[PDB]
Ligand binder design. Structure first.
Ligand SMILES: CNC(=O)c1cc(Br)cc([N+](=O)[O-])c1N[C@@H]1CCCC[C@@H]1NC(=O)c1cncc2ccccc12
Ligand SMILES: CNC(=O)c1cc(Br)cc([N+](=O)[O-])c1N[C@@H]1CCCC[C@@H]1NC(=O)c1cncc2ccccc12
Lengths: 296, 296
């Protein structure tokens, strides 16, 4: 029993974190085989990054893996990431993939400073392609990931904090999530929405954990629920969402559109002083997969 | 910016997790130097554990570290933990300590099944000496820990789930936290209370992160605040608590008894539909140390 914001064990990623310094700028890099990946803004001092990199050489990059200095033998840019070829393959390289995630999906973040891991937490990619992380100066180059069997799927590299305190970054191919750029502009997070399928998944987790007070005998139609969703700035629920919630609905015996009638009531009436899984708000940062992981 | 339930990077503990089997019972053990620590209930089939262990031999214990079988060359009991001496020292043993924690303190939990780590999360030791974990059948022997510089301070080994779904266990010397025993009885979690110094720490974290709506111009006395605390089932605030909150009060310029007047108002009036650090409840599972870790 119980339901926590649960990250993947971070060891396989800890063994890949290094420190990258260029000039007076230090941040984190990801060392996989003989390449170190890091944000290209490490080379900054409205820049043209192609010009900035042409003016650099391998010896301008200091890469440290714990106590060991790695010798850079090549450098190149891939979108907003720099690839530093080093003369040593990381012996701790896990089986890995570079995957790009969808808004509404979750991942673990290994926050790192000066190449040294500091902490691990779970995050969701918001509909507006920001993440509500916890990051300080020096955290750039920290990565987000999921782990399946022995395989690390890297999905996020940290680049910046926006004015509202939320975070923006790239996939590991250097392509930003969302309409953001690695320069100082007035860019800001756009309007957001609540991830409906995740709220439903979390209500199923609550039922599995014995919270039942919000249940009722009613069912709704998909169309009528989506009318309520749009009033409350919730994403539309699709038939694919209903299908994805199938296992949790079978586990609890509560049909998806039955649970949707509960969510409609919670949206229109609130909780009347009660809580669900220790929260007085509707939580939307757990996917159906996340619930089954802790509540099979 | 941002504030998350943030665990310590779990790699140093992942390398210590093994599978212990006795008879048909499997759970997790902690392998440090040439000893594997695990819950003594692995030897059960109102037991007398001294009798149960006298009837066992080394060959009754199967210990597997990933794919490698470790040969047990000695067995002994230490309170509610079994110590299995093995013929190989763990080459991945970190610098470590066995520390016992206080109610109100926090730690990271590496949930494990069949000797294999599944997830990492942060937990607090409740005033009633339970933890609100996330644990399933097979999770016994999972451990809780904090990490400081290179040193893992192990503080918790998981033994059982109580009827309300919360969790109970021992320190790594085998001594239970709280009035619990490793037998089936009608034991249940006792009354709990809210950890006041942690709520205050989290209000300081909120201010550091730009949430200021609950602040006011008033201050209270310690005695008058503690009258309100006892009405709302909050722990008394001590002068030592006030001293511990010193750094956060200096960082924000908000005196501790100034913030106490805010907490009094929140307790008496609620939040009027507003939120603090993404919560509509007063959070008490972050220590002052946890706040400074993410909000220096
Ligand atoms: C704060 N400001 C921005 O983060 C920022 C804002 C914009 Br608009 C554009 C960029 N840009 O172009 O990269 C930014 N990156 C900064 C400047 C270039 C180098 C990296 C810098 N950021 C960090 O060090 C950082 C990361 N995370 C959380 C933080 C919390 C507090 C302070 C700093 C950070
Ligand atoms: C559920 N019941 C108890 O956990 C229990 C309750 C009491 Br009262 C006393 C003991 N006792 O004496 O050890 C208990 N341990 C169980 C019996 C002895 C072996 C270990 C057993 N527990 C787990 O496998 C377990 C751990 N965590 C979360 C779980 C969630 C669901 C199912 C099982 C667990």
């Amino acid at each position: 029993s119980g339901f926590r914001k649960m990250a993947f064990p971070s060891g396989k990623v800890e063994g890949c974190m290094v420190q990258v310094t260029c000039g007076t700028t230090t941040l984190n890099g990801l060392w996989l085989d003989d390449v170190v990946y890091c944000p290209r803004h490490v080379i900054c001092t409205n820049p043209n990054y192609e010009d900035l990199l042409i003016r650099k050489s391998n010896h301008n990059f200091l890469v440290q893996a714990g106590n060991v200095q790695l010798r850079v033998i090549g450098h190149s840019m891939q979108n907003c990431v720099l690839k530093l070829k080093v003369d040593t393959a990381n012996p701790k390289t896990p089986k890995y993939k570079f995957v790009r995630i969808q808004p509404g999906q979750t991942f673990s973040v290994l926050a790192c400073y000066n190449g040294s891991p500091s902490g691990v937490y779970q995050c969701a990619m918001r509909p507006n392609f920001t993440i509500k992380g916890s990051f300080l100066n020096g955290s750039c180059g920290s990565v987000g990931f999921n782990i399946d069997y022995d395989c690390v799927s890297f999905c996020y590299m940290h680049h910046m904090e926006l004015p509202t305190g939320v975070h923006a970054g790239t996939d590991l191919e250097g392509n930003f999530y969302g309409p953001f750029v690695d320069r100082q502009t007035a860019q800001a997070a756009g309007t957001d929405t609540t991830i409906t399928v995740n709220v439903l998944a979390w209500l199923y987790a609550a039922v599995i954990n014995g919270d039942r007070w919000f249940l009722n005998r009613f069912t709704t139609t998909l169309n009528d629920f989506n009318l309520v969703a749009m009033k409350y700035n919730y994403e539309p629920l699709t038939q694919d969402h209903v299908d994805i919630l199938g296992p949790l609905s079978a586990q609890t015996g509560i049909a998806v559109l039955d649970m949707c009638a509960s969510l409609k009531e919670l949206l229109q009436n609130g909780m009347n002083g009660r809580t669900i899984l220790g929260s007085a708000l509707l939580e939307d940062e757990f996917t159906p997969f996340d619930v089954v992981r802790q509540c099979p």
